[PDB]
């Protein structure tokens with residue numbers, strides 16, 4: 001059943017499956033990141049960035065990417081980066097997240113870059129920025145992570 | 152639609168995905184997310200499902216923030232004119248306890264209302280009355 | 294030879310003499326162990342039903358616009374939430390400020406500042422606390438949250 | 445009667461007597477108007493723009509700025525970052541414009557210690573509405589005492 005759906009509801013679902021398809025093709029991937037397709041990558045320099053293409057799926061009634069999704073993008077770049085600095089087997093959880101929505105998210109993609117400010121045995125402070133498919137800063141933020149210790 | 156994609160995890164998920172996408176075309180849900188994630192926007196509730204869980208089997212952070220984000224936004228448009236809307240500017244969020252249980256509840260209340268900027272705070276909770284997240288936000292009018 | 298220097302009076306206008314007077318008051322008090330730091334001395338901070346610090350809005354605390362320096366406002370808030378957390382802790386444990394988030398609402402003015410604080414979460418590793426700063430009118434100067442680390 | 449109240453220097457240890465000495469200098473440099481405010485005057489901050497765009501504010505560390513454990517008061521740290529971020533914002537603004545600290549966020553990392561603190565701020569965004577800036581505080585070793593962001597409202 002797909003009869004009634006318009007253009008926008010067309011790919012807003014097409015991609016939902018390219019992802020549910022991609023999430024199957026490999027574990028360790030989470031749902032929320034699977035659909036939005038927040039692809040994490042590493043350049044030939046060793047750098048790291050979590051950019052993602054903008055689709056009607058991520059916008060709001062103001063037609064700009066959801067601040068909350070931009071939040072999640074930054075949270076990821078920062079989360080995945082933190083985990084890298086941890087011994088094998090360990091994980092971190094976001095303690096505090098502070099975002100500064102500089103400019104509106106629009107265009108092809110958003111790009112997120114993170115950087116460790118200070119790493120402690122328990123708490124890790126990180127800064128990070130989200131740019132546009134061009135270069136303007138969409139958001140800037142920092143946050144704190146804790147080395148998970150499940151009871 | 153070669154959507155012949157599968158296990159049970161995906162079974163349930165995609166069921167909400169579509170139960171939710173076709174709840175938007177029937178225009179009962181504002182956005183795709185307020186529906187895709189059954190946001191009981193009316194206070195804002197969040198049905199805790201594997202669709203909203205990170206790899207560590209708990210409500211995803213970006214989510215708990217979006218939940219708080221939304222609650223806060225509405226809360227600021229209730230005090231705004233028909234031709235003016237509030238856009239998040241800043242979002243401070245403290246994660247206190249994992250997002251776990253049947254659902255998440257986010258209550259937001261304005262701390263200060265100015266001609267250009269409004270300050271708001273609010274929390275998120277689990278069904279058993281536990282406090283999940285807590286943060287502040289600043290919204291500019293447009 | 295400070296006394297030689299304290300001829301700052303030979304020219305001192307009224308507030309010049311009144312600011313100096315209050316400074317020496319606080320110090321004396323600092324000796325009578327009324328405070329822990331000189332910061333508390335000169336500022337004159339005095340501390341639900343019990344936890345709310347108050348700071349007298351004099352010239353020693355204002356900025357080039359005759360309102361309390363947001364710096365000091367934040368320092369006051371940090372004090373309210375700071376000693377508020379110390380109370381909720383065993384003799385063997387203490388806490389240092391980890392994260393401080395503040396939203397400035399109205400210019401700090403009047404005869405004093407009053408900040409009330411409350412624990413938003415008491416966990417093994419950190420204690421999150423929210424709090425607000427008020428005028429002698431009840432008007433909100435600033436609202437902010439804070440995270441405290443246990444040591 | 446500030447004089448008859450100098451029974452403070454007759455039960456005052458080196459530190460206490462050392463403090464007031466600075467304080468008097470402060471207040472003294474205050475009336476000569478070498479400083480607009482008492483806070484800046486009593487803390488002796490030195491501010492300046494760097495070759496790059498960033499802004500710098502250093503603050504001498506003395507007993508006057510420490511907390512019960514001879515560590516720079518978290519408040520003076522915040523107030524410093526704020527000061528740096530402010531002067532930064534204001535230097536990038538027209539003569540007929542000004543800015544006021546709207547939001548402030550800080551993450552404490554290492555105990556402020558040594559002989560002086562060095563806060564460094566840089567603009568992250570420059571709207572005509574609000575100005576988002578960012579900064580860091582360093583010890584005299586280069587160790588990061590604290591990191592934080594601040595949004596400023598334009599007037």
Ligand SMILES: CC(C)(COP(=O)(O)OP(=O)(O)OC[C@H]1O[C@@H](n2cnc3c(N)ncnc32)[C@H](O)[C@@H]1OP(=O)(O)O)[C@@H](O)C(=O)NCCC(=O)NCCS
Nearest residue numbers: 093094095146150151212246247248249250416417418419
């Ligand atoms: C960040 C954090 C770990 C800081 O430590 P803290 O505040 O001292 O938390 P504590 O360790 O004291 O308590 C954690 C509680 O969560 C519980 N918990 C449940 N599942 C857990 C898990 N998988 N790992 C760790 N704790 C878990 C702990 O058992 C404990 O329960 P309790 O209240 O009965 O003691 C804590 O605030 C937290 O868990 N925040 C949630 C972060 C989050 O949900 N992030 C999502 C995006 S990654």
